[PDB]
Amino acid sequence: PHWLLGNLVSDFVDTFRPTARINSICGRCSLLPVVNNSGAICNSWKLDPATLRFPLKGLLPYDKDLFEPQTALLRYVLEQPYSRDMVCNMLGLNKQHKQRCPVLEDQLVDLVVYAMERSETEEKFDDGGTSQLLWQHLSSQLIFFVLFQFASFPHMVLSLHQKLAGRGLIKGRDHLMWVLLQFISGSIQKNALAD
Amino acid sequence: MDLAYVCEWEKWSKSTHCPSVPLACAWSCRNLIAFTMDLRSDDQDLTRMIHILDTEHPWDLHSIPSEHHEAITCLEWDQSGSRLLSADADGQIKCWSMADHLANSWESSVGSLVEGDPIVALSWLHNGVKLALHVEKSGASSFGEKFSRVKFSPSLTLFGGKPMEGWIAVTVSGLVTVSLLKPSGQVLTSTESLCRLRGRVALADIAFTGGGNIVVATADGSSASPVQFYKVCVSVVSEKCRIDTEILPSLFMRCTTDLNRKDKFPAITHLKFLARDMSEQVLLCASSQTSSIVECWSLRKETILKWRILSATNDLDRVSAVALPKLPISLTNTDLKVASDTQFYPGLGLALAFHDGSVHIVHRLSLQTMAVFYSSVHLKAMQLSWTSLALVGIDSHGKLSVLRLSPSMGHPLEVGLALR
Amino acid sequence: LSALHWLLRCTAASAERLREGLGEKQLAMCLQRLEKTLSSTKNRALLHIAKLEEASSWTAIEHSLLKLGEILANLSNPQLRSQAEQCGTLIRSIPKTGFPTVHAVILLEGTMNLTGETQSLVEQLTMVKRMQHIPTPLFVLEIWKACFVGLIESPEGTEELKWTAFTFLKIPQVLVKLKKYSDFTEDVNCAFEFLLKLTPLLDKADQRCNCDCTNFLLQECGKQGLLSEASVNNLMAKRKADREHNIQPNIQLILRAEPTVTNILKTMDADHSKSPEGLLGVLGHMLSGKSLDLLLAAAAATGKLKSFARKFINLNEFTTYGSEESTKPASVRALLFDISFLMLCHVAQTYGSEVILSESRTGAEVPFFETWMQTCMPEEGKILNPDHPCFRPDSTKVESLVALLNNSSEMKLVQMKWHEACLSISAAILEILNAWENGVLAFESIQKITDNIKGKVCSLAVCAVAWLVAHVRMLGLDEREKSLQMIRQLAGPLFSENTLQFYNERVVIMNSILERMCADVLQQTATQIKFPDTMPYWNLLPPKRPIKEVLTDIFAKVLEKGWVDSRSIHIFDTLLHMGGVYWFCNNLIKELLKETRKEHTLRAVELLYSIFCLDMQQVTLVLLGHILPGLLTDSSKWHSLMDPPGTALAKLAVWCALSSYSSASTRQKKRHREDIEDYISLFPLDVNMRDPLNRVLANLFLLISSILGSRTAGPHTQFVQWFMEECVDCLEQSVLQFMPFTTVSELVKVSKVVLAITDLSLPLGRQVAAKAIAAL
């Protein structure tokens, strides 16, 4: 607040702490759905497409985690197979209109670097070992989200370049190149080469 | 030459009991002066305010209350006119940008910090655009012949032809720091010593070269010690900045080998490259308590590279401020001839204020005085304009004055030449 | 005074009624008015100025006080008896720890200028003793403790020699001049018993000196006359009793080597009656291990380094030219040139260059070594111009010299005029370098020329390496590679089988000189020449860390120890040279002002005075001119003028002002000679008054009067009150000569002692005192 009001306003908002405490589903950050492709989305899991925050009723002083971007929920849903329509129903994507949704793009990049880390752990003790399954699902999911311009290719690639830094992530770079080959081979003729 | 206006503070002068501080001044490409002054009334933050003065405005002076805990050393506009870098003693480079595209609301979200070390030189990185003006083609009826781009390379190109924007600052220790602004809001910083022998850098300056190398000159003020030179190369290695320095040929200074009375002028007081992107010529200014000498040096090769002197003044008063021109003239021999014949003198002048009232506009190459303006108290900061027809200057009082310099320096021209 | 007497009589009568009674609140109220009157500073000052006019009523006051104290002390109260004790102490008030500053001043003078005169040190120590009022036993104890601690912490090598010479030869002369310039034997004997309690310090010292260094101290202070002989003998008995629970040590060598310094002066005035072979024998005994260093440490600690340098310089001038000779005599004269030159370079590199200078040469006949050292030898703050006119003497002689070096062995040493040769080597190796850069000379001929230089006479290698260091310092990075090889051959291991005499010792001294010449250039590029610690305090800063972190870490460690090390003194010197005075003083005062404890603030101030004694004068100009007006004028800043740091800061400012008024390192001398500033323009001001310190003091007192006179009293007003109070208390009598006379009126408008001390108490002086103290 302003330095002249000060305590007079701040303590006032603190007395609205119990009301906000009434109107909070406890453990809402750690509750996760079971992804069904059926549609008819329950509106509990909808996030804000601008900032990945839960949409909150009122202007109360809610608990400090409810003002954070819910990346855990979105990463859990993107890691599941056939969670294509559910991510659109969460982030309000519509497919009649292309938008370049940025937080979706950053979450997809971080999903790629997480797959690269988990491929660089060993990937050789267990041949299947959930790694190549993850890379196949990443291929399919990322093809859809870059193809309809909900995310964009070159910003994704150069942000991916900025992440692959200081971890020396090199054991499964062939998989990452394969996924990029899926995008390029899918859409080289539609866009200019400078992309 | 002439005085257009003199803008003074009202009743807010008479700084008492606290001594003066050096001032900064910066004229942008758009006509906005950013400058600091020693107001010193009921607070020392009145010496930490950055005044923005639109030069057509009668008296509307905006006053950014910068949160600089020590005194502001350097101010520096962008290559455009849209951002302003300000750095003080004890680190803390702040990058002010406009708020809601108003020239009256500035706010800095981005900055660097090398704590405790005073920033002594500060510069934006070069974006690779450089053009040259051919005065002998003034009638040539096509703008491609008059102004032509000169194939300059930007330091740190990133994935395309596009330069990164960022700054490089040089501290009073040997430290140099580069901060690179991403197209996103991210900023990468790196500091590294200039050479392994860490030593005092009391004066410093930054030029750029073709090839994307920064060339930073250091001096420790003693005027009998060498003015050392370093080549800095910036790179981005795996998402982080990386600085590679290399020693260049240093120079000593004449008036120390004079051997008649060499002990005079014991302080180098100004070190300036002749223009940023003109890294081969250097203007130095040795000074005693009363007198001074400016000198121009050049790197020219034959030891392959070796600093040789061009010219020097005879003896002056103590130089209080120095302003170098910004108009990028083409500087070769035919253009010197035609700019002497048709008396075009906008890009060939430096201004030298003195500790009496006088101001001398002096030649670039052989420092012979072209004009003299007697103030009728000294200019503590001067800055020429981007077309170099007017010079702004802050005095040893609250007074801020704008002088117009005629393009032929007072020699009368027929009307067709002045028109041209 | 009469009302105080009536109040004392009221307490006496009411206490008598209390004794007869045993609610008697009359005693409580009487004592309350006593403490309420006497608690004010106005009233106690008024009683003190009332003292003078009415003598012998004070006697009745104190006798009534004594009877009051008896009758109250018999019938004590849980609260009133403490009150009566407090009021008794107040009426009497009307008419420790260690001392880190003496410690750090002694350790500073030991570390930086051993060769300084004792009078400056005695003046500084008497100053410190008068600022903070130090008893004499604790003072001399801090001197001895500082000396021994600095000896223990010294690195092995020549610094241990300098510290042994500093304790055993410089400090007794300091105590002698203190005995002159002030019952000293009883105090120094007390301090010696104080010291002899500290057995672990003395045993650590004894392990380093490998003898009973306290025995040598007590015999030395007996010789100087600080101590009586009975005191010396019972102190040595105590020390032996506490101690019970083939090479000579360095202390015996130094104490016997100082008379050899005097007698070597008096015998080599005359060139051993012009016998140069005797000179060669004596100087060859000198270059035998550590003997030169012992003589120099004794001569430096005892003030005779200047005469020693004059003697070797005059010997050098005598052996410059060539007398008419055959082969053998000239081969003695060139060796005399080498020994005198190499020992003079070693002196100038160790004890500074200013002992080599003549300081007045009537006539033009300055010697060869003085000009060579002036224009051609690298020092710490001196970088040399390789194309100065000093390095380009001729073109005639230099071709004769390159033909001389390419002839074979000199064979022509019978007449060389060695000053001309040594001045010409720079041009000679310049032409050699140009020949090698073109390619016209092979590497193998370069080896021949370097052998002809370094073989017969070693000083030629030093002159060549000096020019090579200047020339490599000017060059770029890629252009250096050839010239460094020249140093690798000039500073290489020995050329053999044609050496004159004493070759290995000249090689050892020359390797030390070339280390200290090349070190900076070989730091710029990572190059190891690997000559054989001899540079113990060199390159101390970390390579990349910003320099405020260095400053705050060293000041934190100096506070948590409580004294300043030798290494800490060297880093503080390099930071003062590097970041400048303003940055240094401002950051140390910031680190003061974020302390919150009384104990740590007082210790920090007592250390910071000694740290600022690197350049006291410039630090006072920055402190009283830039830091204090910026703290007093800024409205946001003066919350930092908190009481526990604020009283300490006011103390440090007044100690700095007094010590700068009453009135030191070579970097600081060079930098203040560099500095240009107009203090008339900096302080416009609305004795000389063109001396800048008078200008800063006048400006500061104008600021103080303006702060005291204004409204809005806050912490800054408490600061200027404290500043004026310690100006009063610290003075003997003058810094206060610059005070404006309106401050006399205003200071008792804001309250007291600044009038009752300043008046000097004449009968008319009471009238002005009582006028000012009563009237707010």
Added chain:
Amino acid sequence: SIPSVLQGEVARLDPKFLVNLDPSHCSNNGTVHLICKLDDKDLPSVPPLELSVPADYPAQSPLWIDRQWQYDANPFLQSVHRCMTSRLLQLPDKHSVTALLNTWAQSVHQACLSAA
């Protein structure tokens, strides 16, 4: 030294008032400071009153240095002080010195009448 407007005021005052300069306080500088008095058989003896006249005295109002502690310790001086602060609030702006002195004398008179 003293601005001549104040000499003009003091030279024209009634002989009730006895205005003199304070021995204490800065003198011969911007603002000036006065300790007045009051002599009148009708009025009672009262605390002396302290005035702080600014430099550039006309076009601004002088200030009455308040001393609450001596206007305690009596009911009568309390009434003097209350009535004086009341008439001070009633005063127009940029008043003179004589307006302050006359409100002081009228305040003393009202505090005599209200008491009896």
